[PDB]
């Protein structure tokens, strides 16, 4: 019963190790850190400034004259302005999944779960995680693109044709509120992990082992936020509510991809994105 009455939470030292372990994976796993993205956006960098796309002239100069590491699919370059821009986004999404999946392996005891459970977790998780990481690349003016090489204005994106004009505003709406929390990469590392390990995911065979890890990570994250953001109390709470907004972005995202599947034969969804969106909400 003295053993039974060890209902207490694990020691901070073990949690900090978990925090650090997760962080390293995160740094290794991903190309762009917030710390990095911020350097570019605030201009505190000797790194080449990024090319601002605010209209068609800018866009065309970018496509024509500026060197980009991330490009619109070569086949798709023939297309209407609104298609190309978005096709290029779609391509960078494909990579993000690979990166994200790699990161999840790093989570202590992710692979020790059932693969029917463990694959489901990613199916629902990835876009929530992508939108979370995208916000590091955004401000009210627009979004960083192609590993910081370009910057594309929010208002330009709203000047695109329907339904693409309204496509990105809900992410911008979210990114300005999320970025107001003033999180950093070490906080984000754990928070991403928390997103993946959810017992609410549909079609999960073994919720109990998952709920136990998430609890582990929520404990880890809560302490990390306590240590890292003393000024903001209930950041843990405020941050956990953003998971709601992430969901809502992702559901609306899919519902707009229905329009795209019905509206254009020439917008072709990648086999992987198609797999993930298949039988999703």
């Amino acid at each position: 019963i003295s053993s039974d009455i060890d209902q207490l939470n694990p020691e901070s030292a073990d949690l900090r190790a978990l925090a650090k372990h997760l962080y390293d994976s995160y740094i290794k796993s991903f190309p762009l850190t917030k710390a990095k993205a911020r350097a570019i956006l605030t201009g505190k960098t000797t790194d080449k400034s990024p090319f601002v796309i605010y209209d068609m002239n800018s866009l065309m100069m970018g496509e024509d004259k500026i060197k980009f590491k991330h490009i619109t699919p070569l086949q798709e370059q023939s297309k209407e302005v609104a298609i190309r821009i978005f096709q290029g986004c779609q391509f960078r999404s494909v990579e993000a999944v690979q990166e994200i999946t790699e990161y999840a392996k790093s989570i202590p005891g992710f692979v020790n779960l059932d693969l029917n459970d463990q694959v489901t977790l990613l199916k629902y998780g990835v876009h929530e995680i992508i939108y979370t990481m995208l916000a590091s690349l955004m401000n009210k003016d627009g979004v960083l693109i192609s590993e910081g090489q370009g910057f594309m204005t929010r208002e330009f994106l709203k000047s695109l044709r329907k339904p693409f004009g309204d496509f990105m505003e809900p992410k911008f709406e979210f990114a300005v509120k999320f970025n107001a929390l003033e999180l950093d990469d070490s906080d984000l590392a754990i928070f991403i992990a928390v997103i993946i390990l959810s017992g609410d995911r549909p079609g999960l065979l073994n919720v109990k082992p998952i709920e136990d890890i998430q609890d582990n990570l929520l404990q880890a994250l809560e302490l990390q936020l306590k240590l890292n953001h003393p000024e903001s109390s209930q950041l843990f709470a405020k941050l956990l509510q953003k998971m709601t907004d992430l969901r809502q972005i992702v559901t609306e995202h899919v519902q707009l991809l229905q329009v795209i599947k019905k509206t254009e034969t020439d917008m072709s969804l990648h086999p992987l994105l198609q797999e993930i969106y298949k039988d999703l909400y």
Binding site: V97, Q98, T101, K105, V111, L115, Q118, V119, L122, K123, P271, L272, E275, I276
Partner: peptide, 9 residues
């Protein structure tokens, strides 16, 4: 769900 469980290997 074939591409995903490939990447989980």
């Amino acid at each position: 769900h074939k591409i995903l469980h490939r990447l989980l290997q």
